[PDB]
C-alpha cells in the first residue's frame, strides 16, 4: 500500500555524469561511450552558435569525470547540444536510448552540480512543454530519464529556468521541448492545462489504496465529460485514453466513464474538506503506467 | 527555483542490494563488506525466533547478488535483523554508518523486490514512528538512508505494513522504530501529530520560491503559538526549533515568530482556495535541512 512520487533508481545515470568547463563556465555533461553531451550554451561568454563554436578548439573544453580528466579529441554541435568526443569510453555506460517524450508523460530527473549528482525526483512534461523541476544555477546538463529492464531511455537535458520558475530543455538530440530557445529573450511559459488521463489514473490509485469517498453510482458519456473538461481547463479525454485506463478499471471494477462522473463531481463541487492520497488537489503528474508500477 | 520531494541519488545503495531466500520465503538484504543484513522474519514458516534460528544452518540461506550466488559462512541474530556472513566482501561497499533517526526527520527509501531496486522516494519518520511508504509484498529488507559527502547513513530497514497501510521497520541494528513487533498481532499505528518545525520550514521554502500571500505584518509569542499548535494537533515548537529555523529566517528576513503568526492564520482560516508550493494542505515532511538543500 501507499502511493509516492517515485523515481527510478538513479545509479545507472550517476555513473554517466561529468563536469564540463569552457572558459569560466561550468555545467554538467552526460558521458556515454566516448561522447560527452552537454548544453551548447557552455560556449557562450544574440549569439550565432556556429560562429561561437568555430572559434573554439578541443583544448578549450575541460571534462572531469570525478577525479579523472578526460581528453577531448573532437567537438561538434547537434542542434542545441554539444557533442565532445573524448579518448575514453565510459566503462559505466548502461544500455541506453535517446527517446523524446510526449506532454503528459513522466520521467525521473537526476539534479547535478559540478558533475556531481545531488538528488533525484519525478517530473511530468507539462502540456505547455515546460517542467516544474527543482533546479539552481549550475544545474544545466542534468538529465531526465526512464528505465525499463536494464535500459536507460534518456528524454530530457536541462537548459534554462523561465521567469515563472518552471524549466525548459531539450531531448538528447538537442531539440527543445516547446517554443523555447537557448538565448535570453522575454520568452515565457504558455498557457497550461491539466492532464485528464493522469487525474483519472490517480483516482484509480486512490481507490486501490482504499480512498473511496468520491465514488458514486453514476456514469457519464465521453461527450458530456469532455464538455466539463473544457470548462475546467482539462485536456479532452479520448477513446485511446479510455483504453489505456482499461487495466486499472478492471483491477477496481470501476468503469472509466463511471470514474469520469466522479471527476466531474470533484471539479464542480470540490472535496468538502476531504483528501485523496494525502492531497487536497487533483493530482495530474502520475500516468496510468506510473500507477500500475506501484499499485499492481 | 522549484521545490520537489527529492531523494538522494540511490546508486551507492543499489550496489548493496541482494536477494535472500530461506525455504520458500524471499526478501531483500543489504550487503556491506562480508555481511548481509535482512529481516529475521525470513526464517518464519507466536514464534520464538531463537528457536527458529537454532534449527537453521548456513546452507538454508540462499543469497544472490544479481547473477552471482554468495556463499553463507555464518549466521546470527541481532535483535530483529539477521546477519549472514558471506565469503565475499561487497566490492561496491560505500563508506557507511548505521544511524537511528528521530521522528520528524526524513530519508530516502530504495524500494526493492527480489534483490532488484525498483524505485526511490523520500519519506519522513512520523511522530508515531510509522512511515507513509509505498511498499508491496516482497519489499521487506528495503532500506532507508541519507547521504552526506560520500557516506551513506542507513537508518531504516522495512519489515511490515500495518492495517492503515502505513509502514513499520527497524534501524540497521534490528531495533524497531515504535511500539511494533515482527509478528502478526492486532498492532496498529498510534495517534499521530503534525511536525510543526517542518511546516514552518516549508513555509520558508514557499517564500523563497515566491509564494507570499500568507505572510502578514503580525508576530506572535512562542507561548501563544503553542496554544494554537496544541488545538490543531501540531507538535509544540521549542526554542531549539526556532534556532534551527535561523538560517531560513535570515535568508527571507522573516522572523520565526512572524512566520508562526502566518501558520496560526492558516490553521484557523484555511487557504481560501489558494495553494502553497503546489499544495492545498500544509506539508510537514520537509525538514529545515531539506529546504536549504534545494533552496540555499
Ligand atoms: C535564470 N535564467 C535562466 O535560466 C535562463 C533564462 C533564459 Br530566458 C534563457 C537562458 N538561456 O539562454 O540558457 C537561461 N539560462 C541561464 C543563462 C545561460 C546559462 C544557463 C543559465 N541558467 C542556469 O544556470 C539555471 C538553470 N536552472 C535553474 C536556475 C535557477 C537559478 C539560476 C540559474 C538557473
Ligand atoms: C500485510 N501485512 C504485513 O505486512 C505484516 C503485518 C503484521 Br501486524 C506483522 C507482520 N510481521 O510480523 O512481519 C507483517 N509482515 C508480513 C508477514 C511476514 C512477512 C512479511 C509480510 N509483509 C510484506 O511482505 C509486506 C511489506 N510491506 C508492504 C506489504 C503490502 C502488501 C502485502 C505485504 C507487504
Numbering used by the authors:
A (entry chain A), B (entry chain A): 1 to 45, 51 to 301
Give the exact sentences the study uses for this entry.
We have also solved the crystal structure of the M49K/S301P double mutant in complex with WU-04 and found that residues 45–51 have poor electron density, similar to that in the M49K structure. Thus, the M49K mutation has a greater effect on WU-04 binding than on 3CLpro substrate binding. Crystallographic analysis indicates that the M49K mutation destabilizes the WU-04-binding pocket, impacting the binding of WU-04 more significantly than the binding of 3CLpro substrates. WU-04 in the M49K/S301P structure and that in the WT 3CLpro structure are colored cyan and yellow, respectively. The S301P mutation alone slightly increased the IC50, but in combination with the M49K mutation, drastically increased the IC50 to greater than 5 µM. Interestingly, though the M49K/S301P mutant showed stronger WU-04 resistance than the M165V mutant, its binding affinity to WU-04 was higher than that of the M165V mutant, indicating a resistant mechanism beyond the decreased WU-04 binding. Specifically, the kcat/Km ratios of the double mutants, M49K/M165V and M49K/S301P, were only about one fifth and one seventh of that of the WT 3CLpro, respectively.
The coronavirus 3C-like protease (3CLpro), also known as main protease (Mpro), plays a crucial role in processing two polyproteins (pp1a and pp1ab) encoded by the virus RNA genome. Inhibiting the catalytic activity of 3CLpro has been proven to be an effective strategy to block coronavirus replication. In this study, we have identified mutations in SARS-CoV-2 3CLpro that confer resistance to WU-04. To understand how these mutations affect the WU-04 sensitivity and the catalytic activity of 3CLpro, we solved the crystal structures of these mutants and aligned them with the crystal structure of the WT 3CLpro.
